[PDB]
Design a protein around this ligand. Structure first.
Ligand SMILES: Nc1ncnc2c1ncn2[C@@H]1O[C@H](COP(=O)(O)O)[C@@H](O)[C@H]1O
Ligand SMILES: Nc1ncnc2c1ncn2[C@@H]1O[C@H](COP(=O)(O)O)[C@@H](O)[C@H]1O
Lengths: 209, 209
């Protein structure tokens, strides 16, 4: 396969990317959510889609196993974006990285323990606040950690805040806003520009409203 | 809450642990798979259950946010088991860590690139074969990596082999057998032994057939 390989993830990113792709003349021929398949053809025979864990999107793109991809800023910040090109803020799958803890609980007067998936983001943010912190690396369900005393705060993505509230937690600090971003393999950008360019211009045009 | 907190994961581990718990007089009062809840009470008011990512099970137990837990040997090996006590091989959720690649594809004559979730296990295994390898860290769907040329082999857990076959991959090497294990917090073992002991003896008795 000699065309372009696009790396996406399930849920919000796939949902919200699909209209951008359609306007660029790319449509999936089935629902990837309902399939065990991994590589998907599209209406354009120069473009195929990988469905990955959101976490693996920047990895596949960096190594050139995908030519380009849609990844959240949270994931890009955590992974490091030094070896891909961020070309667009797609303004989709919008949320915030926040810190949070048990509602009205006081912070202990000592080095804080941060339970999070976003270990690099947690360390960098607390460094900006004057705090060297310990991080407990986790993989899901951060909202449980403070309820069983695993760490003093969490760092996680928050959209509505309903998860936090449901668990008697509240956001303490806003870290940054997060949205999905168009990333490109640094070599594919050079070698496959004529394939990429009309799709990038289409996306840019679509985002302009 | 002053009793015992048991850390489990969804799917196979929960399914297969449940009969051991029942025989020990512990039954969940609802299906955790059908709930957004995180902490679950049981029929025994001294025992509650956390439902975690399999990856977070050893973490919660190490830090004492759970007193004990059921984790797969694959996860224990990857995480490191130096700060919990492995008390039982439960002989459940049985599978193998294997290496695998594209069917009949030759290995390149150079330093191999291993796409895997199990970076430590991959490095340790290939070291035993005389190979220093590069590892590409991934989070799911390892069976895609060799189909798009991300690395030369994968390391992953294999049960039936159907996933590998479905994707035109084959197991190259058997690394080790994997089963779920009963782990205990090193302090909870000392402080809460009278609570733990009858549950451990029950599990030991059940496994004996
Ligand atoms: N844009 C997003 N990308 C990824 N995960 C998200 C996003 N927005 C919310 N989440 C997660 O989805 C769940 C629901 O978020 P919330 O609406 O804040 O309760 C939480 O576990 C969040 O971490
Ligand atoms: N005991 C196990 N624990 C966790 N994951 C497993 C286990 N057995 C199989 N899997 C995974 O489940 C899928 C089905 O495995 P298989 O039956 O080998 O096709 C693969 O993605 C395996 O990595």
């Amino acid at each position: 396969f000699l065309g372009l390989t696009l790396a996406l993830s399930k849920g919000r990113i796939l949902e919200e990317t699909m209209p951008l792709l359609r306007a660029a003349g790319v449509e999936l021929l089935e629902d990837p959510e309902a399939s065990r398949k991994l590589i998907f053809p599209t209406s354009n025979p120069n473009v195929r889609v990988l469905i990955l864990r959101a976490s693996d999107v920047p990895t596949y793109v960096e190594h050139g196993a995908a030519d380009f991809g849609v990844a959240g800023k949270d994931v890009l910040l955590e992974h490091g974006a030094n070896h891909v090109y961020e070309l667009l803020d797609l303004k989709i799958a919008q949320c915030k990285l926040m810190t949070a803890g048990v509602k009205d609980a006081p912070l202990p007067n000592r080095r804080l323990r941060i339970a999070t998936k976003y270990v690099n983001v947690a360390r960098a943010y607390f460094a900006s606040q004057g705090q060297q912190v310990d991080v407990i690396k986790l993989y899901g369900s951060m909202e449980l950690a403070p309820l069983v005393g695993l760490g003093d705060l969490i760092v996680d993505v928050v959209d509505t805040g309903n998860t936090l509230r449901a668990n008697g937690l509240e956001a303490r600090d806003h870290i940054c806003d997060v949205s999905s971003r168009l990333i490109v393999n640094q070599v594919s950008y050079k070698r496959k520009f004529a394939l990429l360019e009309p799709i990038l211009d289409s996306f840019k045009n679509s985002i302009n409203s």
